[PDB]
Every structure is written in C-alpha cells, then in structure tokens.
C-alpha cells in the first residue's frame, strides 16, 4: 500500500487515488512575491484552551496527536473560514535531514519539518461526512527550522520511544497545543487538499508566516520512530512529506502585508 518508498511513494499515488493529479491538490510552493494582500480576512481565532487531548498513534505513516473532539472545546474560526472547525489531530511531516520535511514550501525553502493541526467543520456534524466537502476541513500548517529547542514540544518527544512502530499507540492526556503555535498568527491560504491519500480535495489551507524552533535534538528524536511494525525490518520513519503539487486556477492570499 501507499507509503513514502521508492515503489510507494507520493509519485504513485495516484494509480489508486487519480485525484492525485486533481486541480486543487496540495502541498503547494508559496511564492511570497504573487501571494497578494487580501484586507479582506480577519485575524485568525484559535481557542484551545479547552483542548482535551487523549491519545498518540504511530499509524505507519506519521503519529497522531488526537483529541475529544464530541464538542466545541478547541476549535478555529475567523481568518478565511466561514463557521467553526473541531480540533481532531496533529501531525507532522520530517526530513532525514534538517534541509527537507516540509511540505509546503515558501519561495522553494523546504523547512526541517511542518506541523498540521487538523480541525472539521462542525457543519457536516463528523470528520467523515466533512472531508466529502470541499469546504470540509481547515488545516493550520506552521513550519518548524531547528535552533533553539521548543519546550512545549518535549512532551510529544519524549513518548516516542512508546509508539516506536505501526500501530502502537500511548494514552497522551493533558497535551497543550498551545505550546506549539509561534508568537504571529499572520497566515497565507489557498484552498487545496488532503497531503495522503484519499488526498481530497476538502481543505481550506491556514499556513502560518512564521515558523517555530525545535532543537536538532527534538528532531532527531522523530526520526527513530519506524514505519514498520513490531518485529519487521526496521524502516526509519523519514521523508514523509508529499513534494509541492501544481497550484493551477488557484490563489494564495496572505492576511498580511
Ligand atoms: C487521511 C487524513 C486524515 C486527516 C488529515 C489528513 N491530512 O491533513 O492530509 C489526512
Ligand atoms: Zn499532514
């Protein structure tokens, strides 16, 4: 099945997912430069201070951070979106090397990693029913680069060594997200879709201007965790980004200037 190999990877999605090769598919380069200022959007509101996080899964492809989300306890509004979006997981996608693991890039600067806080529209009442929307899902992109450590990230860090392989999981309660969003909420967004299959087209991209800093420690510890399951071949978990997508009739807006 679909992976991040040689004979898995983003390049043959799409014989089993052909919107792969869709219109608004993403990761996109952001090119700083046409990205035009729209006075139009509004700050971004996010509230996590209810969060309740619950659980961290090694799903084979990434780990998942996920949270309650049965009732409006941390949810995004504002910025581009009309309605309010659910907090469900985060995820990140990392390099074998601090010079990739982005996936967005800006102005074709791969950053070392890229963190997604995912969130539904409450709308479509699930995360199921919403990802067959195309104004389903909100995903809050923000980069990271290392240098100095980020201590609301050590938690995250520091179960890893529990959820080493596919399908392990660890309770992972009490978790501020919070800790991980950098000081500006400035943002660039274009509509655009799931990074892994089913790669749907259902996503309204929020992806932060400015970075956060993890340590190279911190990084380096994402990069023992395995694809593989218990007892298989191990297969460090690395390069598990999808490459920048055509942006064709879109446009990426920054809140900005
Ligand atoms: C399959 C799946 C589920 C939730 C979120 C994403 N995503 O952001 O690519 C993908
Ligand atoms: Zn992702």
Known sequence: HWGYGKHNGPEHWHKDFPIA?????????????????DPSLKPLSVSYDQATSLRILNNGH???????????????KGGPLDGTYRLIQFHF???????????????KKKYAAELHLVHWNTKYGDFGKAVQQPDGLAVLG?????????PGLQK???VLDSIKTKGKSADFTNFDPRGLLPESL???????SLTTPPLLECVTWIVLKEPISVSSE????????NFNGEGEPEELMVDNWRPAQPLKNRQIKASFK
């Open 62 to 76: 990434a780990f998942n951070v996920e949270f309650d989300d049965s009732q409006d306890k941390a949810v995004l």
């Open 218 to 225: 911190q990084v380096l510890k994402f990069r023992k965790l």
């Open 93 to 107: 996608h990392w390099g074998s090397l601090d010079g990739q693991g982005s996936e967005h890039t800006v102005d």
């Open 142 to 150: 923000i980069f990271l680069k290392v240098g100095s450590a980020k």
């Open 21 to 37: 090769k869709g219109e608004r598919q993403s990761p996109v380069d952001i090119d700083t430069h046409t990205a035009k200022y």
């Open 186 to 192: 400035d943002y660039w967004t274009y509509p655009g």
């Open 156 to 158: 995250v860090v520091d």
